[PDB]
Amino acid sequence: HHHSSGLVPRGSMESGFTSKDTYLSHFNPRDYLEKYYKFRHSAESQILKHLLKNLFKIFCLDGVKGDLLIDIGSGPTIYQLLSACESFKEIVVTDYSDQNLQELEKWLKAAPAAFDWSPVVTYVCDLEGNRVKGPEKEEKLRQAVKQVLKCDVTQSQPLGAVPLPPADCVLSTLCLDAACPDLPTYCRALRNLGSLLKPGGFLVIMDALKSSYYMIGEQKFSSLPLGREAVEAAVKEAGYTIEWFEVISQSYSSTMANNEGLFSLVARKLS
């Protein structure tokens, strides 16, 4: 405990990178949701719409489908799963932060105090051709989420003792940049996630490019500032082949993150 009043990201003064324990104390899921996912044409909304469009393309237009998808580092959000529930029978959501899991469980039970994902749900329904409306989509997703679990990407077994069948897909959006303090940890985390995947299973990653921090209001958290070349190197070294890789220049507002664009990739676990 050594507060630095924003000079450096919280929990980073000694080591140079936010300790994971900081996500149990100073990460407020409600403030995060209100700041990034309220959904006008704000920088945050444009980023979110591009994530949703790519997730729509990956799970609905491409062939990424199967029995089990594991969402690694879900945070308190479900936007990343709306299209996925159309192609996967079972979805497991995971995060390191207990507060994030509680916010997820509130939404799963449709508790009145849960965050309102309706305008995001409607947008995804629009993308998918308006075959259903918001509430039917929301219920389909809710029925698809079978488990809410603790995850720690720095551990050889990221989900601990919890048994799961080998997954068809591992999805991780806006997680690895924040969870991995260096590239060796990043590569090892991708390797650890591979133990959850069937041979030839799909790895789907979306995250910020060249971002050293991000803000939840005035609370600053560390980010690993990766370029496209380092990301590709880590994924390949972790035992995957990249099927496609996209870079977009759109960035968060300077008051929320110092990223230079976002990347999206789909990979498959090698031999």
Ligand X SMILES: CC(=O)N(CC#Cc1cccc(C(N)=O)c1)C[C@H]1C[C@@H](n2ccc3c(Cl)ncnc32)[C@H](O)[C@@H]1O
Q: Which long-range contacts (CB under 8 A, 24 or more apart) does 1-4 make?
A: none
Quick check: 54 binds ligand X (CB under 6 A)? no
> In the chain, how many H helices and how many E strands?
9, 9
Q: Which two tokens stand for residue 52?
A: 């949703």
213 marked ligand binding residue: no
Say if residue 168 is exposed, middle or buried (CB neighbours under 10 Å; 0-12, 13-18, 19+): buried
Q: Strand 88-95 and strand 145-150: pairing?
A: parallel
Quick check: 209 binds ligand X (CB under 6 A)? no
- Whether 123 and 52 have beta carbons less than 8 Å apart is answered as yes
Selected from 121, 178, 193, 196, the binder of ligand X by CB under 6 A is: 178
Q: Concatenate the DSSP letters of all residues of 161-184 into one string.
A: T---PPEEEEEEES-HHHH-SSHH
Q: In the stretch 136-165, what mask flags binding to ligand X with x, by CB under 6 A?
A: ---------------xxxx-----------
240 marked ligand binding residue: no
73 marked ligand binding residue: yes
Closest residue to ligand X, judged by C-beta, is 75
Q: What's the chain's length in residues? A: 271
153 marked ligand binding residue: yes
126 marked ligand binding residue: no
Selected from 206, 223, 240, 267, the binder of ligand X by CB under 6 A is: 223
Q: Spell out the residues 6+ positions from residue 226 whose beta carbon is closer than 8 angstroms to its own.
A: 177, 183, 186, 207, 209, 210, 234
Quick check: 39 binds ligand X (CB under 6 A)? no
Selected from 17, 39, 252, 263, the binder of ligand X by CB under 6 A is: 252
Quick check: 28 binds ligand X (CB under 6 A)? no
Quick check: 100 binds ligand X (CB under 6 A)? yes
The region of 95-103, 120-128, 162-170, 229-237 touching ligand X under the rule CB under 6 A is: 95-103
Selected from 12, 77, 192, 264, the binder of ligand X by CB under 6 A is: 77
Looking at this protein, which amino acid is placed at residue 181?
P
Selected from 175, 226, 231, 238, the binder of ligand X by CB under 6 A is: 175
Strand order in the sheet with 240-248: 145-150, 88-95, 66-71, 167-173, 197-208, 262-269, 240-248
Site residues (CB under 6 A) for ligand X?
20, 23, 73, 75, 77, 95-97, 100, 151-154, 174-175, 177-179, 208, 211, 214, 223, 252, 257, 259
